[PDB]
Design a protein around this ligand. Sequence first.
Ligand SMILES: CC(=O)N[C@@H]1[C@@H](O[C@@H]2O[C@H](C(=O)O)[C@@H](O[C@@H]3O[C@H](CO)[C@@H](O)[C@H](O[C@@H]4O[C@H](C(=O)O)[C@@H](O[C@@H]5O[C@H](CO)[C@@H](O)[C@H](O[C@@H]6O[C@H](C(=O)O)[C@H](O)[C@H](O)[C@H]6O)[C@H]5NC(C)=O)[C@H](O)[C@H]4O)[C@H]3NC(C)=O)[C@H](O)[C@H]2O)[C@H](O)[C@@H](CO)O[C@H]1O
Length: 721
Amino acid sequence: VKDTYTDRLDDWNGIIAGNQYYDSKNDQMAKLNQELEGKVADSLSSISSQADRIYLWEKFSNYKTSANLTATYRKLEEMAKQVTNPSSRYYQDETVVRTVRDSMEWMHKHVYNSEKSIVGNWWDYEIGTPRAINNTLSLMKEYFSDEEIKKYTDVIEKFVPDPEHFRKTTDNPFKALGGNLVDMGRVKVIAGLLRKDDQEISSTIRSIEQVFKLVDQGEGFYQDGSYIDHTNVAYTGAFGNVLIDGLSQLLPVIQKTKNPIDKDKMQTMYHWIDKSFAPLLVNGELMDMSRGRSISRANSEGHVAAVEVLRGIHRIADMSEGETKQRLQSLVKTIVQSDSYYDVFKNLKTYKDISLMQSLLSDAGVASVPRTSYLSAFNKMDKTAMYNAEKGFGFGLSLFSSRTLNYEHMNKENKRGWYTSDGMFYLYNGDLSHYSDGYWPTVNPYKMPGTTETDAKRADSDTGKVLPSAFVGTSKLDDANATATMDFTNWNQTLTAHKSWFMLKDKIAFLGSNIQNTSTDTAATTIDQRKLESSNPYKVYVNDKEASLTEQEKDYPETQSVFLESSDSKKNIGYFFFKKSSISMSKALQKGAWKDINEGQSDKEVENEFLTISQAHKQNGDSYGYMLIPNVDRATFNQMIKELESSLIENNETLQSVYDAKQGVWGIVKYDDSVSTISNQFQVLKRGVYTIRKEGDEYKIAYYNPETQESAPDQEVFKKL
Ligand SMILES: CC(=O)N[C@@H]1[C@@H](O[C@@H]2O[C@H](C(=O)O)[C@@H](O[C@@H]3O[C@H](CO)[C@@H](O)[C@H](O[C@@H]4O[C@H](C(=O)O)[C@@H](O[C@@H]5O[C@H](CO)[C@@H](O)[C@H](O[C@@H]6O[C@H](C(=O)O)[C@H](O)[C@H](O)[C@H]6O)[C@H]5NC(C)=O)[C@H](O)[C@H]4O)[C@H]3NC(C)=O)[C@H](O)[C@H]2O)[C@H](O)[C@@H](CO)O[C@H]1O
């Protein structure tokens, strides 16, 4: 017979497989089931047989590569899903049942058991493999005896005995937090259920509860929405995904155990969704600046990664109720519906998830209204996300400081993300596929957009660094206006620049001063490197005069503006140079392979066309200043830049400021404590970042000191003249 433990595992199966929700007449479900049918068949026809072999599958033979461990167990899990799916051609198949039971025994005797030691990555020994095993056993529990289950999970207890720590069999174990902490639950809570071990369950759950705390230091979610992981990396979009994705699968089960989690304790979850996740999603795309090294993975481009968060959010809404359930549903609905590029079902991998998404999209009772404008200053992870609902464009500012790592290159992934945080900017417009379709393996890693750098060669073997300066941060006035700055110094301290950004509702001014180079390499700022669509060509205008770009760089001296004109106004990009400047442009096909940036990816060649614009800085004390104006047609652009003829208030080594006359808003960055009189109306007195709005004879002030990470009383930083 059985019990409440199996009852929980039954619940878990419906969440992880959802065989009980399958419907052959359901288009989406049938498609996933067909995908699983093909996998099992491939696995079944390639599995080695006769006289105990040296590998189950030739592709994952080398048992010294921990990867081959969980990839092998995942193949049995797939078999477990189909074998328990009444609509599968493998339903209760004697061969498939024996193959799983045999493969478990073989692997246990020769590759993964209690007498072994972590060989390769610990993750596979404590997370990857134990999960695949728990799932396989949970699904086929009616084919395995309890003795066999215990026997097969003992090794999991060996490698992961402590619900609070990972790598417990090593010399350098670590306290499980965030995503890892959630993975700890999918490992020990399930194993606990399978082993009918209450202690394991309660302790692991008690341990999981730690995930609900907001932090003000270290890894985790901060009150400002930032999410830090791997000590000091902005990671909402990769580890955050795993956290929400995994937690949402677990909660329903945990909540039905002897130790359910208090409602109040789970409160923060909605804080993550609203403050941390939502702002990073633009037209179904999860901003790459928050995905760490995941960006180097071919099967995880922006829209795909976003579904990871969305399915988690949807699962949460589903266990919620009333308003909370309602608004979360609308949130998922509208995001999914705004995505005209990626089919959300391509990354919904269980029948329950597919089913939930179908009823949501078809339920007219659930409002799907375009999201309104917002600007999130994630100062605790040095990132800034901006979105204009009226004009429909998104903007992401990627930086780092003494508090954060610039880029993550680990496990051979993201070998060339060197400059992706050196003041790199992201523009999300009509082209929802911009940062997809092989953008990453084809983008020139030496000219990330918005970054100022020398052309020195870089080594793939390099790893991240924190920034010398702490003067990096964003002062947000409201949902449409904010100012940011970065006291920049390049990787080898040969170049510096005071880089500042002024987000003014429907445009962003880029200012750079104090540019210095002590090296022999050339210094230049990449104004942009935009990925083109062969289907939607741009007509390039320089100073409102058609220009023909070539692979070979062309120089445009005395350039006052550049305009990228598409047939779709929502894909237009204009650049107004406050002062006539010398720039270079070129359009060229850029080839590459994912393997180039991620050892474990395919070496198949990829290619994309890119339009590159940059400004060389040949002298010390150089600078740049331009306004980025997207989503307006040519005639409107040409008109807008005439009005903007005097928006630049200043741009030197101590003061940088842009003024929006239409809005009555000022963006200001001060590098010293001198008294700065602005537009003869007011005086700003402290080193820091400001965003001020004049409303009549009144002034709205948004002041931020990025070093101390504090604001300050109005009279300390601002003086009305
Ligand atoms: C050098 C060193 O050791 N430094 C240490 C540092 O160690 C590093 O730690 C991290 C870390 O995780 O913290 C390690 O990072 C991870 O490495 C693995 C291995 O390469 C990556 O794969 C992983 O990226 C994630 O990988 C998953 C995976 O492939 O398993 C992705 O998985 C999918 O996620 C789904 C969401 O729930 C899940 O459902 C799915 O499984 C199926 O689910 C079904 C269902 O329920 O829906 C179903 O039914 C099924 O039965 C079930 O199989 C799961 N599987 C698949 C195949 O897709 C995940 O989406 C992806 O993001 C990577 N993590 C990240 C975030 O990138 C790193 O390798 C270690 O070296 C320590 O962490 C650090 C401590 O602070 O100290 C350093 O010194």
